[PDB]
Every structure is written in structure tokens, then in C-alpha cells.
Design a protein around this nucleic acid. Structure first.
Ligand SMILES: [Mg+2]
Ligand SMILES: [Zn+2]
Ligand SMILES: [Zn+2]
Ligand SMILES: [Zn+2]
Lengths: 268, 97, 171, 107, 178, 557, 112, 84
DNA sequence: CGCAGTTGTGCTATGA
DNA sequence: GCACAACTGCG
């Protein structure tokens, strides 16, 4: 019944999810438009912990002596103290990260940090390091502008939908939303420099990979998700072996849209 | 052996459109019938030698096409006709979408 | 009469031809198939006009075999006779039954009966002829005929004609 | 809008469509105690203008049928006084995208 | 595989009421006055009178022979033998139809020179007659307005007896002498 | 196989379902289908001008068809017809026939309700063919009088004479194959109290349906070209040709007719009883008797497994196999012959695990490899190789079974007086043996996975089992307890591409079901990988060297 | 919309109970499918087999003949847009490999 | 109806399915003795010859990417990116 | 006119 | 051997 109910469902050349009628089931496959194989449970670091340890991790204040990036971190550090124009960028940077946090906390209400998303950002930085023999001593050649802006410019190139019109353009923005939160989480000015210790060369590579790795991650128009989903629910249902009706018979109840269900509870 | 209903499913899942047609036709049932362009039924009297093609009843000797369908379908079709139901096969469309 | 119609034929090329003189081959293959052709729908397809500008269009590669089908859009000179059409032609055959007149690519036959009473068959004539008080119709004899009816046969159209009405007959 | 206490007789019920283009709505006071829309599982439903709808269908190369449907009697459809043909944009938060926009045509 | 046309109509199941075709100006479905073309535009039916016909095939086979040699880089009785040459060059030979057609056209052409054919077309096309009549008038040679209106019975009340006669008079004057 | 036909080759774009108009049935039919007797020109073996090849399809295998020529594998059947003595219902439409009767007036053939009723125009509005009929029926089943004068679309003071006829309407309830109505009547306003009870004749119902307005049935489910209500009632019977009901002619002198050939003879017999019964001295009770029987025979031929018990059991107790039953799911046409299928180029054997096979390969026994074939086309690239395989013969391992010429003619290298000297010309096909490294579809039933069917590399091995790599056990659900698996060999260079480029085991490695890999290191390897990796575990040079060599990608360092 | 939410929750809780993990998208699709139509469309013979999809497609599950009978009765027209129809017809289905068409461009065939 | 070149919307990258059918089509054609638009560097398997063709972007085929509504965008094997 | 109560109807894993 | 969908009858 699962396969027979879905068979005719696929991802069409407009990232839409339709059947033989061309009736839209999902506007963008699995709300994001990604091929499931290209996902890995990643951690959204912005999410939890004290606002105090959050600040410690993400906040840059070139205007404060105790809260600038030490010139041990980058070469520009000595000549960065007091740059009001730059502190404007690090103010958007921080005010955006703060924004992102309030959003993730709205979406994942339990404070769950570990979510399955495309592009293993952890591994890219890992390889950047072994690739470029990252000196966790000598200061970076990156600019505050290099980081801040290069990350802005990256997000723009992370394409799922393509269409040139607000309807489509806004669905692109939405479908991407969560990934960039993680992207901003892992690529904050303080993080990139202190933790990662990347060079401009290393950073540009990190970004370039994220871009093309993301592009790889998207669903392929033609992808037979009718059966793909039907099999993926059905298959584990086979391996199946307060006290409420559960497993195979509850699943039977759910699919049947059982009017007279066995164990109906109300959690008040 | 059997390329069962369940095997068709994974084959679709795979997106293997051609390997499926090949399994379902060329490696089994595959057959060639002649259809009328007016009433899409296997009514055609295919004297494919003298190139005579006729669907008396339709008075047609012009609008005839050859189709390749599983013999089980030719059957299913003749089986439905035997039951007063016309499964008219048409090679062009009208509806759109 | 003699029309010019914008037709189109579907030709399926074998992969061995997906070379550079492909358009060349398709154009020549159209001419093979199309020229001299005779349908009851369009009549005799005689000459494919504008060889230089034949619209090849893209050819979709067929599912299980490699051949690719193209709809070769064209325009040609056609001759499709009509019942009631008056035609000038030249006599070809002639017997006791009547005479068959050559009109373009097609043959119109006039029955002994579809001629006036004054015109009568001459058996003892070399070559065979029909003799009126005034006229003589033998072989080379140019005639004017009203096509009484047409019969769409195989790869030809034939007709039965009249020379009985006014302004018809010998010319 | 008519907020009736206990019940409306089928007498008076037949008088609702009697005066168009003015439209009348009946609401049982007892249902209204709790605002259904405020609930966890109930996302943002947004009425779309004739022009807004027109663009959605244009932009997705859609026919009204092809669109996911909301019933006329859908609690949220009644809350926004949805009329047959009127489309809603549904903004749900996503465990994959963050934010997902769906659309529902009325019944 | 046969040939198709611009006429895209879809008679579903409904076989017939296939109309009898006569020069009651009721030509086939294929031969409607109002019709389409490859460009997708509406266009009035093209009918040729012999000579207007003979010149088309002549032209086409000449421009064809141009390309047959371009890609190969890397007086009535007297015109008759001349045409049989062009046919041996551009036509498949198997097309005995086009040979008989050319021989017929050569001997039965009313107006030899193109200038003339162009001028015939101007004269007749102004009349507002149907293309099959503008055809028949150019190909069939008539003297009385009655000779014409009998053979092209489609006319009848379409043209004035005198006005049709004025045309016929100008047509005989144009008649290319052999 | 089948021969060249000049006919333009297309694909079925739309399937326009409709109903047979007796007129069509007659026209398309190459014979009628006069005598129940199968064949035997009065015991003389050859078909009778009455049933099966009265110009229909053919039997004899030799001896071609009487309409086209071609014969057996080429000739699809040629339809027949029996002109029924009395109109009979179609077993299937019987309920819809009642529902149409319940909608329309049983006298003038006018819809019981129209645009004048508001709830009616509301239904008449419904876009959907089926939902519309459903709503119309619910309103019209209640109307028991064909209205003459309905109240105007404004006042109930002034009345509009909408449609003709005033007649009271029956209450139709089915009595299995029979529709019997109970009219209200009047009798000093009272009646009923004691109504009028008569069966509604197929012919009467048909005559009401014939009189149903194009626009009225158009408002009902119906179509004026493909499905007129009147076509639910059968007058002319299509006689399916031999291929639908094959004569299993075992040995020379012995028939063996199909179930349908029998039921038709029964319909035919029952029709001829009725035919003469009525024409002659009609005892008018035996008339509606022979009718009900013909109605039964035509009912059970299309559906034997009906509500009102009687199983129309073949004289053997075994009930007659209806056409309905033939198409009915899991096995039978749709489910089992079309959606599922028995296939050539398939193999099956016991599976045993191999530690020395690369993940993506499959051990195919020499026998299986020599049986299954691949159609290679003689190309300057292969040419020489293929000549050696042809030369090698169908009995060696690398070798071939058949050679197919340009002239689409099969050469049996196994027998052919020329298998030795056979010079291959380009474009010929050489059906050669499944050679090592070919893509093949390996499969283990059930098959609830994209992964329960994967593309493997051939590796021809001795001993009768299919050998597969242990790590690939997990996605098939295989074990070596005695499990068997299937093998499908692709036939096209295009199909090979499908398997290799999409279905390959290396591709199937990370599953979308769980967004995690579906194969891992298992059992002996899993137990040993721990055993080896402990801090306490050290290896002397002797073995270190062998262990290094064993890894095929080792850099020699 | 809240019904879809609760439907997924309930569906998810069946899978998660057995320990097992199924990627969101899958269960979301099933749920989204049962949802779209307007209300709760049952994954049964009188639910998804109700929809306006192809008659040849629907006949291939549950009311086999009955579906085909009612097809000809109310002159249904098969789109042949569905997978199943192509399987029945022995045609290459508009699935992955068959979701698009392939063409030789003579212009590029002479460029090389 | 046919989307113009200056208005295409679909992935500028080649689908996993596209590449598989493209490779299979040239392999079938090459095997059917079609003309090869690449230097066979001793190559003999139509798939490898095809893969080589696709790599040198010397395959002369066009993908008609159909949209739900019927319209299509024609993309060339040349213009399609092969990130795969 | 509505809803309790019934009568009715179709399905029931996969290859040998 | 259920689970529902038509259908039917009394308050
Ligand atoms: Mg086992
Ligand atoms: Zn026909
Ligand atoms: Zn036959
Ligand atoms: Zn009445």
C-alpha cells in the first residue's frame, strides 16, 4: 500500500514534488531540496550554553581593549583596535549570530543542537588544516572584511532553486535558512581566527569546498522519491518486534486512518 | 525467473527506466500489434507483405500505426473488449498539462 | 489545379549516419521517399521545392535502439485531380471501349459512351481511332476532358472523363 | 459574524445566504473560548489577494487543482473567513530548512 | 510512414461525414481556401496554372542542381530535350511521374516567359476569384465568356459575362507564341 | 522474430476508455458466430464456419489465419460477434443501470430533477463526472413523480410547465440480474397501501435509456461518443478470438478447448433456445425462462463470482473461470502478468560468502555463465575477439551460443554445419557468454529496498554457488543458511550503463533511508578488527610483510 | 496543518520506538501525501485509490476490474503520465533516466 | 512550448540520470557503428569511448528537460557541468 | 431530516 | 477476520 500510494511521486526539473496529475505534494523536496545520502548529523553551536560563553565564543569588540582579537591572531590586529567602520561589521556579525540563536531556539524548542544537515563543515576545516599545515602559532593574513564579507558572498552562491522572481527567490532563501545558520555558526570572525587559525588561502579553499559540496548535496530532478520514501518507511517496519498500541498495529492504525483507534490518550 | 511486482518497485526507486523496459519487454512479453488511428483498437488487418493495412468498420487504409506493447497487455485489452469495454489506444494527445 | 502544399515526413536515421553529412543524407532520403509519391490525400507529390532550405529540426534519439527520428518539415508541388475539373491532355491508349488521355502524371479514360453519338470507333485503323463526321481521335490527338470521377489506386489516381458536353473534346 | 450561545434553528440558518454580496458567519461561543490558532501545532496561515494567487500559479506553472487544498470548514479557514478559491500561504518551521512555505487553496 | 500537413484536426472515433469532392468549389479537407504553413501563419491556398506550374519545378530543380554541385566542391521541342537533362541531373529517374509532368507542362504551357506569367497573375489575381478558378483560367484557353463559365462552372454569377470576357481578351494577347 | 511492417511506429500517449456500441461490435467483427460447435467439419478435423475461425484467428500452428495471413506469432486475434436474441444487462453495470433508472423518468427519459431545483443546479455544477452523478443520484432517488409543472424560479404562485409526462415512479430494488420496481399508484388518494409489482424488462430500460437526452446523460457520468447509457445493456456480443481462449491441442486427434470457448457455446446454445422459442409458438413463460438463462450465461461469462450464489459450475463441479477472475490481482493479468513478469536472461542459485571477492563483484558459476548470454554487435573494436569466442563455441568458457546476421536470422553454433568456418560481418550480433566484469543485477527476495537489487561485476567461478562479499550481506538481508538469490543480465549497452552508472554496489554504499551507510565490516572481520587493534597486540616482521603484500594498493613502503 | 504535524509525530514515534531512524523527508512525504488532498486520505483501497490518477494505474492495486469497468462506463481518459501505465504499456517510463528527452543537434555534430 | 535560452531555470549541472542516459546513448550508438568524435586512444569499449567523448565534451547530444506543465528547456552536453 | 444499526464487500508478505 | 462503506429505518 505504501509503494502503491506513492510510486508516481518524483522531483521535477523545478525542485517541485509531484505525481501523475502534476499535483504538488511538496514545493521543495523534504523542505530543503537535498538528496538524503548527502546529509550528516551536525551540531548547531549557536543554539545552547550560557549567553556568557556564547559571547566568549562569538563576540569581537575592536573598540574594547580586553575584547579585540589579539595581534597574535592576525597581522592587522594592532591596526584594528578602534576601527569604528570595522566594529560596524563585527556588530552586524554578532547581531546576526544573536538573531540566528533566537531562531534556532524557536525551531528546535528542546534546545537540541545535533541536526542532520548537508556539507560536513567540521571535516572541511579539518582537511584545510592538514592540507595547508596550519600553524597554531603564526598570525593569520585574513582581514576582518575578508572573513565577514567572504561568508556573506558564500551564502549567495548556495543554490537550490534558481528562478528570477520574488516567489522563487524567497523559496530559495527559506529552503537555505537553517544551513546558513550553521554556516555563520562555524564561520564567525573570532572562531575562524582563534579556533581554526586559517590563512586567507586556507579560508578561501574552505569556502570554495562548502560551495561546491553544497551544490553536490541537492536532489536530482528525476529522483523517484515516491518509492524511495515508501521503501524507507516500509523496510524498517519489517524489522519490527503508560501502555499505548505500538509498532506494526499502530502503524496499521495510522495508515488505515483508523476511526476507532485502540489506545487513545490526551497529554494535558 | 520472476521480475515480480516488488522488483519493479526498486527498479523505479533506482530511476532505471530503460533497464525496467528491457526487463519487461525485450526479456519477456514484447509484442507488435497494429492499431487504428480513428478508434484506437487492434482491429487492423495487417497483411504486412502486400502492405495492406485496413480497419474495416473504420473504412481506414491510411491512419494505421504499429505499437510495441507486452503481449499480456494486447491480451488484457482483448480481454476488456470481450467484456464490452473499449480501451482505445491513441498515439497523440489532446488534454495538455 | 496543381497545388503547392507544406507537408512533413518523419525519418528515422540509423546511428551509423550520425556523421557530418547527416543533414545531406536526411534531405536525400526525404526526396527518395517523398518524390514521385502518390497519396489520395494529397495526390501526386512531384517536386520538393527549396532543397537548400529544408527544415531538418532536431531528431529525438529513440529509446531502446540508437536511431533518431526527425520530422522533416517541407513544401512541394502536388497534383490532385478533381471530379468536375476540366483538363487538356493527349490521347495514349484507344480501343473499342474508349480512349485513355494523359494529363500530367495521371491517366483519364473516356468511355465509348462518354463521347457523342457521331464519334464512332474505327477498328480497321492503323493506329486505332475514333471517327466523327468532322473529327478524328487516334493517338497523338490532344483533347479537352471533364473529369467525371476519380479512383485513388495504390501509388496513382485514375479518372473517368467526358467529352460529351459543350467546349469539350478534340482541340 | 454571529456569535450564538447554544444553537441556531435550521429556520434562521437558511437566512445566511439570503443577502449577498454581504456574507454571514456563524460561530458557537463555546468553540471560541480557546483560540485554536495560538496552538503549538498550528502554523501561520496567510490570505492571498487575487493578484498574489495569480502570481503563485503563474510562478509555479500551476492549475488550481494541482495546489494542496484546505477545506472550507478547516478551523483556520473559518478563522480567516476563507472563501472557495482563496489561497493561504502556510509558514511552518522546518527541521531541514528552518522555514518552509506551503500553499493551500480553499474548498 | 506517409506524409502529414499543417492541418492538425483530431476526428476522435467519429469516422466520416467525408464530403464528396467536386469543382462546386468543394475541394478536400487538405485543399481548403484558408490554411496553415511551417511558420504557423494562415495563408491562402496555392494553386498553379500550367507554366506558372512548369516554372516552379524548373526553378526548384535548378537551385537543387546548384547545391548538388556546390556540395560537390568539397523553344518548346528544344526546351523539352533541355528539361529531360535537368531531370537526369536532379531527379531519381524512378520518378517517371515528374518526367511525364514536365513533358505535359512543356507542351501544354499557355505562357512560356516568366515576365508574361507574372503579368497573367496580376490580371487574374485582381478578380477576387477562388484560387482554383484563377488557376483554371490561366491554364485552360477560352474565347466566349460561355466557353469559360461552362468549363469553370464555379464562376457563374461570380463574374460579369462582359468583365470575364475582357479578361479572356487580355489573356489571349499575353499568350506566348511558339 | 516478427516481420517488418511498413506501419509508422509510435507510443500510446492516451488510453481513451469507452463502451462498445452494438454497431461497432458488428462492424469490427470478421465473423458471426452462429453455431456452438467448435470445429470438426462434422468430425472432420478443421475449424467450423460457426465458432472459432468462421473467418476469426487461427489454430493448427501451420495453416494461416483466414482474414490477415501472417499466422500464430504475428496474428493477434480477429474479433467476432453473436447477435443476441434479447437485450441483456452487463453483469458489471447492473448497479449503475439501476442508479441511472433511479435518476431519470421511466416513461419519457427525462431527468427527474433539473436546473429548476436549487440543490439540483448545485449538483449539476459539480465538475467531476463521478461526484456529479453521485450527488444527482442522491437528489433524484427521492423524486417519485416526473414533474409536469414545477413552481417558477421566483414565485410558487405561478408554475412553469418545465417538462412533459406526469407518471408515478417505481421503487427499484434488484433481484439478482433482475430489476423489479414497486409503483406508488393513487386509488382515491390512498394507494399504496398495496402497490403494483412487476419486473422491468431489459428492453424497456433500454428504450428509456435510448430516449435519455444527450445533455441529461452528459450531466450523469456519460459521454455521447464513448459511453452512452444504452451501451451498458448488451445487444451484440463480441466474440474474443482464439488467442484469448486457446484450444490446447494436445497430440493430433484430441481438442482441449478453453473455459471461455465453453461458456460462449453455452451463451450461444441459450440464445438459440430463445431465438426459436419466441419466433415459433411462444408459450410466453418459457420465453422469459430462456431469457433469464441467456442473461445468466452472459452474466457468468463476464463474472462468475457474483452475490446471488450459483457458481455456474463446469460439468466437473469446478466453477467456470470468468473473464473478471482472469484480471483479478496477485497473479492474473494486471498484477501478475503485466506489473510483474517471468523473464528470460535470469538465473538463481544458493549463495555462499567469499572473503576474496571485492565488495562490488559476484561469483557466477561456469554453468550459469555458459547459459546466460550477451548480444554483442560486431564492431571493428571487438570483431577479432568475437570471432575467437564464436570459434571457441558454446561449450568452453569464453565462447558464444548464437550468431545473428543482418538478415535477423539465428545461427546455432551448438549445431550449425558452419560453426567452424563462419566469417562475422560488422553489424551482426554475437550472443556471447556472460564474461567476467559484466554488469549484472543481483537480487534477494523480498526486495523492500533500492539496495535489495544491486549491480555487481561478474567473476566466473567454479562450483555451483553465487559467491558474494560478506559486507554486502546487510542490504540484501542474505545469510548462507541455504538462501538463494536472483541474477538478471542486461541485454543493451544502454541498460549496462543504467546498472553501472546508477545501481552499482559502490554507489549504494551510503543509504538515504537513514542518511548513513548501509554496509559495514561484519562478523569474522568485525570480531578480528578489535582483536588486532588492541594495544597488547603486536606483529613480528615475518607476518607484517605478508599482511602488507595482501593489501593490493600497498605502496611498497 | 496541525493534523499533518500530529500525523508525522505519531508516524515518527512508531519508527523511533523500534530504535530505528528514518530521515525526515520520507515520513514527511507520506504524511504530506495523506494531507494535501484536503483532510486525511487513507493509505487504503478507498483513499489514495480514490484520486483522479490514471485508471490503468489504479486498477493495478485493489478494485482491478471494477476500476476498469467504471473507466469505460464514464469514458475515462488515461494520461499515461503515471509509472504504472507505462509498465502496462511496455513503454519507457518518465522516471529518472526517462524524465527528459535526448536529441542529436546537427550543428554541434558538424562542429566536432 | 519551449523555454528560450535566455530564460532557462533548471540546474546548470548534469543530473545523475542525465549522465547515465547520455553515456548509455553514446555507448549504444558507438556500438551500432556510429561515428566517434574523439581520438580513441586505443579504446575499444563503447562505454569507455563514450566516457572519453563526454570528458572531452565532444558528445553532440541535447537534453530536452521537460517541466510539469509540458514546456521544456533544451540543454547541451557541452553546456552542462559534470560535478558528479 | 439525522444518526444508530445493519447489510455488504474487498483485501489478507515473497520467491521454488 | 477485520475495517470500512455503502445502505436503510425509526426517533
Ligand atoms: Mg536465511
Ligand atoms: Zn478503427
Ligand atoms: Zn489474422
Ligand atoms: Zn416523464
Amino acid at each position: 500500500r505504501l509503494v502503491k500510494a506513492l510510486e508516481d511521486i518524483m522531483v521535477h526539473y523545478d525542485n517541485t514534488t509531484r505525481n501523475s496529475l502534476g499535483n504538488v505534494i511538496q514545493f521543495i523536496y523534504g523542505e530543503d531540496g537535498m538528496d538524503a545520502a548527502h546529509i550528516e548529523k551536525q551540531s548547531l553551536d549557536t543554539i545552547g550554553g550560557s549567553d556568557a560563553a556564547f559571547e566568549k565564543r562569538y563576540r569581537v569588540d575592536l573598540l574594547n581593549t580586553d575584547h579585540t582579537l589579539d595581534p597574535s591572531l592576525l597581522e592587522s590586529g594592532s591596526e584594528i583596535l578602534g576601527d569604528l567602520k570595522l566594529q560596524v561589521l563585527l556588530d552586524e556579525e554578532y547581531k546576526q549570530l544573536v538573531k540566528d540563536r533566537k531562531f534556532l531556539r524557536e525551531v528546535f524548542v528542546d534546545g537540541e543542537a545535533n541536526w542532520p544537515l548537508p556539507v560536513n563543515i567540521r571535516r572541511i576545516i579539518q582537511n584545510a588544516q592538514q592540507t595547508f599545515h596550519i600553524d597554531h602559532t603564526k598570525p593569520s593574513d585574513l582581514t576582518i572584511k575578508d572573513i565577514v564579507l567572504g561568508v556573506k558572498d558564500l551564502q549567495e552562491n548556495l543554490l537550490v532553486l534558481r528562478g528570477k522572481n520574488e516567489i522563487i527567490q524567497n523559496a530559495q532563501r527559506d529552503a537555505v535558512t537553517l544551513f546558513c545558520c550553521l554556516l555563520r555558526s562555524r564561520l564567525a570572525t573570532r572562531r575562524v581566527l582563534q579556533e581554526y587559525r586559517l590563512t586567507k588561502q586556507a579560508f578561501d579553499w574552505v569556502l570554495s569546498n562548502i560551495e561546491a559540496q553544497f551544490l553536490r548535496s541537492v536532489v536530482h530532478p528525476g529522483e523517484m522519491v515516491g518509492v524511495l520514501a515508501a521503501q524507507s518507511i516500509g523496510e524498517p517496519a519489517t524489522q519490527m518486534t503508560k501502555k499505548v498500541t505500538s509498532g506494526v498495529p499502530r502503524l496499521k492504525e495510522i495508515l488505515n486512518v483508523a476511526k476507532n483507534m485502540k489506545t487513545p490518550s490526551l497529554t494535558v | 525467473l520472476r521480475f515480480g511486482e516488488m522488483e519493479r518497485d526498486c527498479m523505479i526507486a533506482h530511476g532505471a527506466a530503460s533497464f525496467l523496459k528491457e526487463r519487461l519487454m525485450e526479456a519477456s512479453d514484447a509484442f507488435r500489434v497494429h492499431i487504428c488511428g480513428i478508434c484506437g483498437l487492434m482491429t487492423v488487418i495487417a497483411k504486412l507483405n502486400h502492405n495492406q493495412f485496413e480497419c474495416k468498420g473504420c473504412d481506414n487504409k491510411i491512419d494505421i500505426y504499429q505499437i510495441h506493447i507486452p503481449y499480456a497487455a494486447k491480451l488484457l485489452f482483448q480481454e476488456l473488449m470481450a467484456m464490452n469495454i473499449t480501451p482505445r489506444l491513441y498515439t497523440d494527445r489532446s488534454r495538455d498539462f | 489545379m496543381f497545388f503547392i502544399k507544406d507537408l512533413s515526413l518523419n525519418i528515422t536515421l540509423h546511428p551509423s549516419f550520425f556523421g557530418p553529412r547527416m543533414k545531406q543524407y536526411l534531405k536525400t532520403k526525404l526526396l527518395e521517399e517523398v518524390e514521385g509519391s502518390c497519396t489520395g490525400k494529397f495526390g501526386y507529390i512531384l517536386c520538393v521545392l527549396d532543397y537548400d532550405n529544408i527544415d531538418i529540426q532536431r531528431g529525438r534519439i529513440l529509446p531502446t535502439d540508437g536511431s533518431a527520428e526527425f520530422n522533416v518539415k517541407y513544401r512541394a508541388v502536388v497534383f490532385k485531380p478533381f471530379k468536375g475539373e476540366v483538363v487538356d491532355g493527349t490521347v495514349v491508349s484507344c480501343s473499342q471501349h474508349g480512349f485513355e488521355v494523359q494529363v500530367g502524371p495521371m491517366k483519364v479514360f473516356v468511355t465509348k459512351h462518354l463521347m457523342p453519338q457521331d464519334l464512332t470507333f474505327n477498328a480497321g485503323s492503323n493506329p486505332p481511332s475514333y471517327q466523327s463526321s468532322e473529327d478524328v481521335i487516334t493517338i497523338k490527338s490532344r483533347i479537352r476532358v471533364k473529369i467525371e470521377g476519380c479512383i485513388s489506386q495504390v501509388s496513382s489516381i485514375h479518372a473517368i472523363g467526358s467529352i460529351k458536353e459543350d467546349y469539350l473534346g478534340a482541340i | 459574524i454571529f456569535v450564538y450561545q447554544n444553537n441556531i434553528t435550521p429556520s434562521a440558518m437558511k437566512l445566511v445566504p439570503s443577502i449577498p454580496p454581504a456574507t454571514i458567519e456563524t460561530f458557537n461561543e463555546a468553540a471560541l473560548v480557546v483560540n485554536i490558532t495560538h496552538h503549538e501545532l498550528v502554523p501561520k496561515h496567510i490570505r492571498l489577494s487575487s493578484d498574489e494567487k495569480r502570481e503563485l500559479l503563474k510562478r509555479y506553472r500551476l492549475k488550481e487543482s494541482q495546489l494542496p487544498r484546505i477545506q472550507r470548514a478547516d478551523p483556520v479557514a473559518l478563522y480567516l473567513g476563507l472563501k472557495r478559491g482563496e489561497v493561504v500561504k502556510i509558514i511552518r518551521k522546518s527541521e531541514t530548512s528552518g522555514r518552509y512555505a506551503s500553499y493551500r487553496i480553499c474548498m | 510512414v506517409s506524409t502529414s500537413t499543417f492541418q492538425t484536426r483530431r476526428r476522435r472515433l467519429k469516422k466520416v461525414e467525408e464530403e464528396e469532392n467536386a469543382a462546386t468549389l468543394q475541394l478536400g479537407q487538405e485543399f481548403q481556401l484558408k490554411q496553415i504553413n511551417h511558420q504557423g501563419e494562415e495563408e491562402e491556398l496555392i494553386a498553379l496554372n500550367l507554366s506558372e506550374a512548369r516554372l516552379v519545378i524548373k526553378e526548384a530543380l535548378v537551385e537543387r542542381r546548384r547545391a548538388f554541385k556546390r556540395s560537390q566542391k568539397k523553344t518548346r521541342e528544344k526546351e523539352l530535350e533541355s528539361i529531360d537533362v535537368l531531370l537526369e541531373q536532379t531527379t531519381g529517374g524512378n520518378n517517371k511521374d515528374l518526367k511525364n509532368t514536365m513533358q505535359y507542362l512543356t507542351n501544354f504551357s499557355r505562357f512560356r516567359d516568366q515576365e508574361t506569367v507574372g503579368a497573367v497573375i496580376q490580371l487574374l489575381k485582381s478578380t477576387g476569384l477562388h484560387p482554383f478558378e484563377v488557376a483554371q483560367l490561366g491554364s485552360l484557353a477560352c474565347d466566349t465568356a460561355d466557353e469559360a463559365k461552362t468549363l469553370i462552372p464555379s464562376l457563374n454569377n461570380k463574374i460579369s459575362d462582359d468583365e470575364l470576357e475582357r479578361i479572356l481578351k487580355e489573356l489571349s494577347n499575353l499568350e506566348t507564341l511558339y | 522474430g516478427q516481420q517488418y511492417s511498413s506501419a509508422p511506429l509510435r507510443t500510446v500517449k492516451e488510453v481513451q476508455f469507452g463502451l462498445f456500441s452494438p454497431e461497432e461490435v458488428r462492424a469490427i467483427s470478421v465473423a458471426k458466430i452462429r453455431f456452438p460447435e467448435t470445429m470438426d467439419e462434422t468430425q472432420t478435423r478443421a475449424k467450423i464456419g460457426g465458432l472459432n475461425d468462421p473467418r476469426l484467428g487461427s489454430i493448427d500452428r501451420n495453416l494461416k489465419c483466414q482474414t490477415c495471413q501472417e499466422g500464430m506469432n504475428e496474428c493477434p486475434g480477429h474479433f467476432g460477434h453473436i447477435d443476441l436474441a434479447k437485450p441483456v444487462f452487463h453483469v458489471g453495470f447492473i448497479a449503475k443501470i439501476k442508479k441511472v433508472c433511479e435518476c431519470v423518468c421511466m416513461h419519457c427519459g427525462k431527468l427527474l430533477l433539473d436546473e429548476h431545483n436549487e440543490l439540483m443546479r448545485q449538483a449539476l455544477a459539480i465538475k467531476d463526472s463521478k461526484k456529479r452523478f453521485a450527488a444527482i443520484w442522491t437528489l433524484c432517488k427521492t423524486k417519485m413523480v416526473c414533474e409536469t409543472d414545477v413552481p417558477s424560479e421566483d414565485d410558487p404562485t405561478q408554475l412553469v410547465s418545465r417538462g412533459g409526462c406526469g407518471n408515478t415512479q417505481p421503487t427499484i430494488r434488484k433481484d439478482g440480474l433482475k430489476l423489479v420496481g414497486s409503483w406508488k399508484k393513487d386509488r382515491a388518494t390512498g394507494d399504496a397501501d398495496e402497490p403494483e409489482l412487476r419486473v422491468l424488462s431489459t428492453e424497456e430500460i433500454l428504450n428509456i435509456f435510448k430516449h435519455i437526452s444527450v445533455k441529461d446523460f452528459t450531466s450523469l457520468g456519460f459521454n455521447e461518443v464513448f459511453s452512452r447509457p444504452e451501451w451498458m445493456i448488451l445487444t451484440c456480443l463480441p466474440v474474443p478470438p482464439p488467442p484469448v481462449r486457446p484450444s490446447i491441442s494436445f497430440n493430433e486427434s484430441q481438442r482441449g478447448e478453453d473455459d471461455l470457448t465453453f461458456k460462449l457455446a453455452d451463451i450461444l446454445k441459450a440464445n438459440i433456445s430463445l431465438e426459436t422459442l419466441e419466433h415459433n409458438g411462444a408459450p410466453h413463460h418459457a420465453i422469459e425462462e430462456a431469457e433469464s438463462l441467456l442473461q445468466f450465461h452472459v452474466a457468468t461469462y463476464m463474472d462468475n463470482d457474483i452475490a446471488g450464489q450459483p457458481q455456474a459450475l463446469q460439468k466437473s463441479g469446478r466453477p467456470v473461470k470468468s473473464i473478471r477472475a482472469r484480471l483479478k490481482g496477485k497473479e492474473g493479468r494486471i498484477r501478475g502478468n503485466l506489473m510483474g513478469k517471468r523473464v528470460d536472461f535470469s538465473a538463481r542459485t544458493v549463495i555462499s560468502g567469499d572473503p576474496n571477492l571485492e565488495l562490488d563483484q559476484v561469483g557466477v558459476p561456469k554453468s550459469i555463465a555458459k547459459t546466460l548470454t550477451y548480444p554483442e554487435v560486431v564492431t571493428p573494436y571487438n570483431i577479432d575477439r568475437l570471432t575467437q569466442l564464436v570459434r571457441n563455441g558454446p561449450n568452453e568458457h569464453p565462447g558464444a551460443k548464437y550468431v545473428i546476421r543482418d538478415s535477423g536470422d539465428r545461427i546455432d553454433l551448438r549445431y550449425s554445419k558452419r560453426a567452424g568456418d563462419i566469417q562475422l560481418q560488422y553489424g551482426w550480433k554475437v550472443e556471447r557468454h556472460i564474461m567476467d566484469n559484466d554488469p549484472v543485477l543481483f537480487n534477494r527476495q523480498p526486495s523492500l529496498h533500492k539496495m535489495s537489487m544491486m549491480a555487481h561485476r561478474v567473476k566466473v567461478i567454479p562450483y555451483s554457488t553465487f559467491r558474494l562479499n560478506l559486507s554486502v550481506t546487510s542490504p540484501y538481508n542474505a545469510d548462507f543458511d541455504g538462501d538463494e538469490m536472483n541474477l538478471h543480465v542486461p541485454q543493451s549497452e544502454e541498460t549496462r550503463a543504467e546498472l553501472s552508472q546508477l545501481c552499482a554496489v559502490p554507489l549504494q554504499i551510503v543509504s538515504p533511508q537513514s542518511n548513513k551507510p548501509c554496509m559495514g565490516i561484519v562478523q569474522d572481520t568485525l570480531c578480528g578488527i578489535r582483536k588486532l587493534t588492541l594495544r597488547d597486540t603486536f606483529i613480528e616482521l615475518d607476518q607484517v610483510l605478508n599482511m602488507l603484500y595482501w593489501v593490493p594498493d600497498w605502496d611498497g613502503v | 496543518e496541525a493534523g499533518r504535524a500530529a500525523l508525522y509525530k505519531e508516524v515518527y514515534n512508531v519508527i523511533a520506538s523500534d530504535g530505528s531512524y528514518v530521515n525526515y523527508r520520507h515520513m514527511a512525504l507520506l504524511v504530506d501525501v495523506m494531507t494535501t488532498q484536503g483532510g486525511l486520505t487513507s493509505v487504503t483501497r478507498h483513499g489514495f485509490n480514490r484520486s483522479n490518477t490514471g485508471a490503468l494505474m489504479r486498477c493495478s492495486f485493489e478494485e482491478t476490474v471494477e476500476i476498469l469497468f467504471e473507466a469505460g462506463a464514464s469514458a475515462e481518459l488515461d494520461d499515461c503520465r503515471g509509472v504504472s501505465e507505462n509498465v502496462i504499456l511496455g513503454q519507457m517510463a518518465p522516471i529518472g533516466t526517462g524524465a527528459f528527452d535526448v536529441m542529436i543537434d546537427e550543428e554541434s555534430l558538424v562542429k566536432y | 512550448k519551449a523555454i528560450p535560452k535566455d530564460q532557462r531555470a533548471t540546474t546548470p549541472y548534469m543530473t545523475k540520470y542525465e549522465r547515465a542516459r547520455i553515456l548509455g546513448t553514446r555507448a549504444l550508438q558507438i556500438s551500432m557503428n556510429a561515428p566517434v568524435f574523439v581520438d580513441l586512444e586505443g579504446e575499444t569499449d563503447p562505454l569507455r569511448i563514450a566516457m572519453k567523448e563526454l570528458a572531452e565534451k565532444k558528445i553532440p547530444l541535447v537534453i530536452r528537460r521537460y517541466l510539469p506543465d509540458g514546456s521544456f528547456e533544451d540543454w547541451s552536453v557541452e553546456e552542462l557541468i559534470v560535478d558528479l
